[PDB]
Amino acid sequence: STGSATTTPIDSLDDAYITPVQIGTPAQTLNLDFDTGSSDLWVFSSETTASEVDGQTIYTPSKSTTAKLLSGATWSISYGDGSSSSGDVYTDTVSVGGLTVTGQAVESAKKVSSSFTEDSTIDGLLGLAFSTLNTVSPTQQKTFFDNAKASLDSPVFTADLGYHAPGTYNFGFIDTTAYTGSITYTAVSTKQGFWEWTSTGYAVGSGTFKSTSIDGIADTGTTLLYLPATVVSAYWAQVSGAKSSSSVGGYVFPCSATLPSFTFGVGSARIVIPGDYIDFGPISTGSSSCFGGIQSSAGIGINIFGDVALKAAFVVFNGATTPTLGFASK
């Protein structure tokens, strides 16, 4: 089997992407944030504290003839950015782009933190990291991909995120029309539960390539590109007036700037992030200070190849017995 679904930016900055997901019988369609950095499929629901729902579409398990309470199971997750959610668990039928999993754990939120409430466009998350990170207790549950894998034509999914435009998540096949050149594959460590890999270096604009190993995660659920402070300083030094602002929480730059590109290495191959992808707009409405899309990972504990990086590539998440990651230009 295969599946193919369009993923759409939630706003004009590509702060996140949402993908429609069918849950239950009859189908209830929710728009979920596909997150290769976590492993829980959780949704706003009829059980979510009423004051914490503000415009999201909810899953109502009592209206699904295929929903079953997973008795005794609870979940609770806290993301790196400080947001969180928790609740109980149902199993139900879940379909993405025509690919169907029966008996998928659907984690129903009883509580969500303020940032979730405040974002009316995201109805929940669909985790695509390794199932070892799944938070369901006392019986850990499998991700949608893990459950689908054996049925898929090939045990892979691909992320093709758009810049200020829709893109595609495919399951079970590689669309050879969706990228240019060849796909370069690189090793993955699953030791921390992430799609963790090592970039071979970087360049800033038309500058020379610096060969250096950068360990990090391929994380569709993180907006920005977070790299070591040395790398980030080298990038922003090429933008007149750019500076790190403790009050704003990262590098800012004059909105009048033209940003240089940033290149990262994948083996001997190179992925070029155009400068415009690195612009996240005014820090507050009407400001002429703009927020940068490349930020320091110092104090995160890991480097993160988030959407800014991934949207410059066609990315293969290869879930073979020994997982790997593939990157192509597009």
Swiss-Prot record:
The chain holds residues 90 to 419 of 419 of the full protein. It comes from Cryphonectria parasitica (Chestnut blight fungus). One of its GO terms (molecular function) is aspartic-type endopeptidase activity. The gene is EAPA. The keyword Hydrolase applies. GO terms for biological process: proteolysis. It is an enzyme of class 3 (hydrolase). Residues 17-328 form the Peptidase A1 domain. Disulfide bonds join C255-C290. Keywords: Aspartyl protease, Disulfide bond, Hydrolase, Protease, Signal, Zymogen. This is Endothiapepsin. Belongs to the peptidase A1 family. The active site is at D35, S199. It catalyses: Hydrolysis of proteins with specificity similar to that of pepsin A, prefers hydrophobic residues at P1 and P1', but does not cleave 14-Ala-|-Leu-15 in the B chain of insulin or Z-Glu-Tyr. Clots milk. Its EC number is 3.4.23.22.
